[PDB]
């Protein structure tokens, strides 16, 4: 849905490393592993936390809001 | 639903104490002390520091059930040595070692420059 704040196993705060990850993947044309290493995710728990996340919220944000002010 | 509150792990309940001692009749000069709202963290530490004592014949602990935070520690010492005294000495030794470690780690961290 949206990037989890903390890695489930260890607890490293990885909710602030999603937009940086996407910018690395897009602007710097880095592959996934090098970007994960760059962000500081050395344990494969955090690496699977950030690597396999699916950003469903974009989909949810396409629909017009039910309550619009 | 039936899952109890987490704070019951470390919070003393009403009408019960942290420590309770029951003499053991299987062997002479032996006690079984139930420690409440504790776990392996204190259990292994206290066990090892009791076994470092020379006059402690037997010292062991068990957590009877993972559901409840409490554990039983049996202590049997030589004649003329109250097992409560063994517990006192083990706790004192643990405190002294931890204080020395805290001082040493503080002095070692103060030595860094890239922090």
């Amino acid at each position: 849905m949206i990037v989890p704040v903390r890695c489930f196993s260890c607890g490293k705060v990885v909710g602030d490393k999603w937009e940086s990850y996407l910018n690395l993947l897009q602007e710097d044309e880095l592959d996934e592993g090098t970007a994960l290493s760059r962000l500081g995710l050395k344990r494969y728990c955090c690496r699977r936390m950030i690597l396999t996340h699916v950003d469903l919220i974009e989909k949810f944000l396409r629909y017009n809001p039910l309550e619009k002010r | 639903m039936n899952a109890p509150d987490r704070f019951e792990l470390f919070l003393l309940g009403e009408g019960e104490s942290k420590l309770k001692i029951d003499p053991d009749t299987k062997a002479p000069n032996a006690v079984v002390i139930t420690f409440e709202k504790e776990d392996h963290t204190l259990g292994n530490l206290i066990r090892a520091e009791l076994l470092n004592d020379r006059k402690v014949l037997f010292a062991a602990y068990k957590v009877e059930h993972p559901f409840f935070a409490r554990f039983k520690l049996r202590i049997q010492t030589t004649e003329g040595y109250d097992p409560k005294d063994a517990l006192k000495n083990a706790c004192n030794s643990i405190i002294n070692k931890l204080g020395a470690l805290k001082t040493n780690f503080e002095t070692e961290w103060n030595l860094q420059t890239l922090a």
Partner: protein, 391 residues
Amino acid sequence: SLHKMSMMAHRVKVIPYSTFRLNLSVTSPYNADFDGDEMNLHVPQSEETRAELSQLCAVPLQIVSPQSNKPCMGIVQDTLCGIRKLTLRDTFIELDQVLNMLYWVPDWDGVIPTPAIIKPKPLWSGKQILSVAIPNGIHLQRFDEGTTLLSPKDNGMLIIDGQIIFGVVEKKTVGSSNGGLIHVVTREKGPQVCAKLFGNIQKVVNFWLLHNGFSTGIGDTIADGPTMREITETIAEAKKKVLDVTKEAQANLLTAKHGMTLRESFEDNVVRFLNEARDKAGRLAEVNLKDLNNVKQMVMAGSKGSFINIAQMSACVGQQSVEGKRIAFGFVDRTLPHFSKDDYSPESKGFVENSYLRGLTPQEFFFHAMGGREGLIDTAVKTAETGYIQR
């Protein structure tokens, strides 16, 4: 609830969670797993029903089943494996772990046994510590295959006055077998003492296994290079023999065994050769497996698995059979449109020469799917028919 042991009187222990909790041993009479099973609880509403329930239907009174005049409960799953690991000769326990394991036995008499080794380091053996759980006054003497009064293989079992003199404690001893520790304890000391023995053994062994650890992984399904080469050579030799039999049948030189047709004898010989091929490959793999192999450890303890599981995971899955015969020609004269007509080679009719470690080819995957489908269908039909017969 197919028998009286599947309905037993228990004692309530109130717990702060949302599931019924029962001992691992008492699952064996109930045929109960923990993968979503549900169980029922009936409460008597009078002192008379309460009393006769406690005095006739109590779990300890049901340990020895009239079904086969042998105990219906035993040491199972982790504990069983753990106990095999605990009673090995190599297993020596230092003072601190001995003290913990002794305290973990509720009825421990309070005296530390003299260690099996006193100098230069006091070490207790696993048998010495486990003998504390066994009640005082129990004599057992079972002689396994090839054992002597000395035990070069540490097999067999000799318990004298509640002390395990020798023998690895495993399924044959603490399991639900006639003449085992469970049967002897319940017949000599009583059902209550047998239940106490269950509790003590499980407690000590589970503590030891918690602080020793037991795992299993992909490497446990891997045989080294020479063994894989020998397994492939065995499969190739079996396939060559099958090809020779097929030649002798197709050249009409094969004679039908008396009482059956030519095709029946040919299929019998092919299936026998392939079955003994998978058996030989599994035996090679099992011999290759070192004593530290985790799947081998589980099989030896008897807690779970068998030789066939090792054979299928490591050496060869084998021949897939439908209705007791090989995979049938669902298409015209052929099993799949990926095989030419009249192809009776082992791969064309469901033989799975690949282990689960190696993975299955698409055709072998489909044939195994058919075999498993037959298994599920037979399970459903059998449970229905057995229910009707039982009623």
